[PDB]
Design a protein around this nucleic acid. Sequence first.
RNA 1: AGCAUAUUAGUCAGCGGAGGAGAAGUGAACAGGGAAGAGCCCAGCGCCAAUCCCGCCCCGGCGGGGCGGGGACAUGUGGCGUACGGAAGGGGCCCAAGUCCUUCUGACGAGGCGCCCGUGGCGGUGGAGGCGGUAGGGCCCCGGAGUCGGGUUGCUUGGGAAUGCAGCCCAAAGCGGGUGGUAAACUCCAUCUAAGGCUAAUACCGGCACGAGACCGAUAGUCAACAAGUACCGUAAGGGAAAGUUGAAACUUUGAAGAGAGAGUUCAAGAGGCGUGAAACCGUUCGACCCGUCUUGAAACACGGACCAAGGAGUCUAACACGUGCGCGAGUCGGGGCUCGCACGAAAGCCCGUGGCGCAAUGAGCGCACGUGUUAGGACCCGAAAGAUGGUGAACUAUGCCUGGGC
RNA 2: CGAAAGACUAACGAACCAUCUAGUAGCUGGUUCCCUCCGGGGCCGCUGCGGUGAGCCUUGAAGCCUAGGGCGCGGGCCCGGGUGGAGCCGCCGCAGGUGCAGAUCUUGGUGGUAGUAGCAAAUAUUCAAACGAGCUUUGAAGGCCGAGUGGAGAAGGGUUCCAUGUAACAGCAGUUGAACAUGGGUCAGUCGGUCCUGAGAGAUGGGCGAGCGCCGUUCGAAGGGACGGGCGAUGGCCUC
RNA 3: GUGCCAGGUGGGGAGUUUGACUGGGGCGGUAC
RNA 4: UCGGCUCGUGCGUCGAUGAAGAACGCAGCAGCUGCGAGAAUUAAUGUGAAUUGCAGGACACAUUGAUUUCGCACUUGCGGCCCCGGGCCGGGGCUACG
Lengths: 55, 52, 130, 47, 73
Amino acid sequence: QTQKENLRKFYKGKKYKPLDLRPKKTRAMRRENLKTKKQQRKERLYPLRKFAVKA
Amino acid sequence: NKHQIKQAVKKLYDIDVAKVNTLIRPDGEKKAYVRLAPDYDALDVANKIGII
Amino acid sequence: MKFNPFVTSDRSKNRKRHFNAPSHIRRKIMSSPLSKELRQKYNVRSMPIRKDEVQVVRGHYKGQQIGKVVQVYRKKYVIYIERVQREKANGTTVHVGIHPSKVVITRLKLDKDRKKILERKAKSRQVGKE
Amino acid sequence: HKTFRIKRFLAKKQKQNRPIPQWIRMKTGNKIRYNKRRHWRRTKLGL
Amino acid sequence: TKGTSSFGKRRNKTHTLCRRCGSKCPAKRKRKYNWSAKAKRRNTTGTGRMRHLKIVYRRFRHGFREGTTPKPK
RNA sequence: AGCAUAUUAGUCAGCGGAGGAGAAGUGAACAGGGAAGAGCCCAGCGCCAAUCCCGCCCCGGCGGGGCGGGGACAUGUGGCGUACGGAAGGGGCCCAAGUCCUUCUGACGAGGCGCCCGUGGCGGUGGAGGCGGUAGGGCCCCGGAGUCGGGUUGCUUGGGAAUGCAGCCCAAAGCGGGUGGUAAACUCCAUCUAAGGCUAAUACCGGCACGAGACCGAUAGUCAACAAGUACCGUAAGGGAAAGUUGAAACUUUGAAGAGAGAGUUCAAGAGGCGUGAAACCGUUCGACCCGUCUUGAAACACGGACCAAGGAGUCUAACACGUGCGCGAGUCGGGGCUCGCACGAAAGCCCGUGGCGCAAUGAGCGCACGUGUUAGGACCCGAAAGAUGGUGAACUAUGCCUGGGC
RNA sequence: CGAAAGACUAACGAACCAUCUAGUAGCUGGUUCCCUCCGGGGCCGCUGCGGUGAGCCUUGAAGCCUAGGGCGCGGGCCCGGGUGGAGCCGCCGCAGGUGCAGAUCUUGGUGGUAGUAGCAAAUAUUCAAACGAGCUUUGAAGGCCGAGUGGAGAAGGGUUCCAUGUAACAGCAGUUGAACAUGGGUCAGUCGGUCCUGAGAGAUGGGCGAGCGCCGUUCGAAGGGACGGGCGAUGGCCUC
RNA sequence: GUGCCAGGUGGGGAGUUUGACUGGGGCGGUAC
RNA sequence: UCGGCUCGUGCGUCGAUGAAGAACGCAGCAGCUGCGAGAAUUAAUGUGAAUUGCAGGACACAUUGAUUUCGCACUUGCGGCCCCGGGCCGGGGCUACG
């Protein structure tokens, strides 16, 4: 435990680290909010409105 | 293997080894006969270890 | 009547859970009532039995004599008491197992954990009363 | 003439041909009364 | 002499122990068929130790958390 | 009732590829009513490399900012824009009330106070609301080619001069092309815009974790309530059991010994490593042919039946017919929705009449229930010789080869 | 595969294994309570559910046994007695995997046969002693095997090997055992494997193939290795 | 030569059929 | 009756960071089960005085505090490259295809 905590402090901040020091969630999980300028402009010009009926 | 067994015996019991014979027993354990150097008495060494 | 789902009320499931309970659950299952004096003092009805001075109120050994608990064999769901015992064939003496629900705790072996457990139970009781 | 793997299989099969310890008969929920015993002539190994 | 006499000439083994399935399954894929469901259930996920899947189930019940510890005393 | 087309059936077996959903975007469609509801993006044509990937410094889904080098890219990246036109919740710990009086018992019963709690009336403990629990609470620009279409072949479909798919040959057009359920020529009309792409009511006999049942109760229910896919069988593919229950609580003497006689425990061993404990089987104390069955005819020299226990064969679904019972009646009948929360409640209650059947025929009462009959399904139960798909074997034997041994 | 007999292909005129498959059968077998009527009724019976019986029960439920007392045309039922030890039944409805003598029925158990068939292939045993509660061991005889009933291995077995100790099994017995129990035992540069390729098996390239894949084994840019020389090997600081 | 279609050949192989009545069945016959 | 069967609900998570599955091994004194040479389990957290068939835990009273094997090949056969230590031996890291 002491060795591995020292190793994790050592490799913190490095782009590439040993595989055992990389998170292991699930092969599928290791393999989103980017929008095109077109979609951003569409959202800005036509946002969803809050409305009520029969008033 | 025989080299590893000889080195391990030398380091653990601070002794010299003449030769090592090995067999694998019919129960799956490996038995080693370590013949010591002539200038070492296996009886005294065994007493030091605890056997005999 | 039980209304909460995720609670079984099924006989086979209840019995399986009871008979395969881990020891830390068997601790609270093996609980005994406190005497009237202790119940009045601590405002607590029952406590898990510890390795305590108790009385026997059911069975062949029921009576007023007070004996110290000497063993809590949670595997067999019985406690051994100081003088509640029997003679074997060869004359040796063996303890007779008593279920904790048939014993009344007259004196508590108190430590910090026991005192904090009693305080927790009393505070919950007084919150409920209010 | 044996291989290492066959000999290890035989050793494991030998270490399983012993009677149950007697004290296991004294346990709280014991249903066993004796040992899956194998005899070299009566039953043959899977080889 | 096709019976008892011929049974005495049995000295050479056709089969030996397999290094993958252990039975007395070199193809990368495993031999399995739908016409023998009994054989399929004799060897399937859950008949072994599952020495990695059970831990996966336990970790799923908590969201696959890692890099954290319960709060120290 | 044969059988070849057909059916079985685009089904079983076989192969490939996933996701939490996927895909889509004999005998069907459309319209109608609901559940849900969501729309979009390229290429192309145009204008303006405006685009993307890969050392230093500063802030457990490796991103953001600054600075400098390399590459991709003009055989085309990016912005505008594509038919509707465009541009200019988990985990942990807790919380009510009888072990009151008499009494039964080996030890929650019975008789009282009905006493006490109740937002609380399953399990354990030697028949319990009064130990765990439970209930409810706490911490101007504008179109996709070997593509459409055509022929032919094979499969496929309800698709019929050919619904879809695929091979081969031919092989496009642009006021064009497809469709308009009968082939074709001419001609009006309607409708959409193929040959590029993305996209959130439904399914779930595997898995994780739960709840429940007019289900089975150890020859039943999973093969498996138990050291069960175990023991065991087969070279192998594979095949595959039987098997739950003591109780409430676990010294003397004969004999070589197993085994007995006393003694002892327990309510009980007339419970002794086993609840109760049946039958078959054994130890001891005058008329009258054998049933079941097929048969014209059975006591038959026709077949099955040594004996006893347990199991064992007309079921369920759908359709139709008739009969009967009930409600309403020219009508009658509610998949979806709304009722606070799911003990009972997957109940019950209420409503959208779309629709079904009936009220009209001819030509090219309803709904509910019960019974009986005829069916399709394993179809009252057991029973072939066969057929098909995919696999395992040349340890016997058959033949060829290699390398040995022998006469 | 067959010097051919439809022979052999793990005890064949189309192997074995699983599935389709509970394949189909105008054919054989079986098809479970009583009474009544013609030629439906069951205060019959079984299991479970809704109601009801201020039902029954450790002062003893179910179940089982009984040359006890009865009822019913009977399907059956009631009561007495025993032993048993924890639940059960009546009535009104509802529901069904609901009644057995047969099926060369399934599973389990048990008879007569019956203390019967039988324990008859390979020449053969005897005397004495010892241990022991009671065919073994020792000695002595007489015999046998005589290309072995001798001494060693391969395949196969897998602890059966050795010692000690001692109900079931060794179709009589056992003081004995390949049985049971406890504990031991297999030592390699030199004896094998390991190395070679033999018949052959089988990757890569390539081809084929819906696909798992399989065809092919020489039909492709298939060399990763050589003492010798200089930059830089300088490195021990240049011997190799 | 290969791919596709067309004609022939094709018990090498596949599937199937090979009536009924009837002084048993077959042969005969038709009382089908 | 701590087992089945049936219905329903929620979720719907495998793998080269090496899975499913197999083998072997691990307890003071076979199986099943649980584990991996740290082997009948270590750490942490919660809980709180047991585990138990048998004697055997000083359980700091701040009761920290009981409860492996399955680069080339499949015979442990044979390598190669780079480091480390001991003088060839041992250790570590690499060396599959697309």
